[PDB]
Design a protein around this ligand. Sequence first.
Ligand code: HEM
Length: 154
Amino acid sequence: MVLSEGEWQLVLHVWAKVEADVAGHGQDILIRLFKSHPETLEKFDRFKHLKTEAEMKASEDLKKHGVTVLTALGAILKKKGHHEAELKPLAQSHATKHKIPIKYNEFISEAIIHVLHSRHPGNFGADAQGAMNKALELFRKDIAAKYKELGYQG
Ligand code: HEM
């Protein structure tokens, strides 16, 4: 798939707001993911022990990882489709080291959309959400194809 330039501008316009507070958005998104789909928490040996939302909110390590996640994702989106080089090491570690099934990428995509909708309603109308969804679908499709190449797929 290909996004038009107008769709990329909608994506990067709301991302510019996210970047005003990377740590806060990273926290909100990962907590959303873990609450909504507790099974994903099990993949993080680092965080598996966190029992409540309050414990998650107080973990500086979780907040650090959320910054890491959003920085990597932002670098990818800013490539506007030309993200082959950035995707390869990400696919390799998630497929081979962390053993993350493809389905869980849909779950974090959902959490990203939820959080932007909650924090940026004026910049995240129907069209901007449609564009962000397309951008994340593009990402998931490309990462899934890499998984298959690397010998995981799934
Ligand atoms: C938007 C999708 C995602 C991005 C951009 C992302 C990015 C990253 C980055 C940059 C790292 C650190 C370096 C590396 O190991 O590659 C990482 C580590 C990791 N990610 Fe992801 N990730 C994503 C989705 C997920 C999902 C869906 C899960 C699990 C449900 C996951 C599980 C992990 C784990 C277990 C680690 C290692 C944490 C540790 O240091 O112990 N990732 N991720």
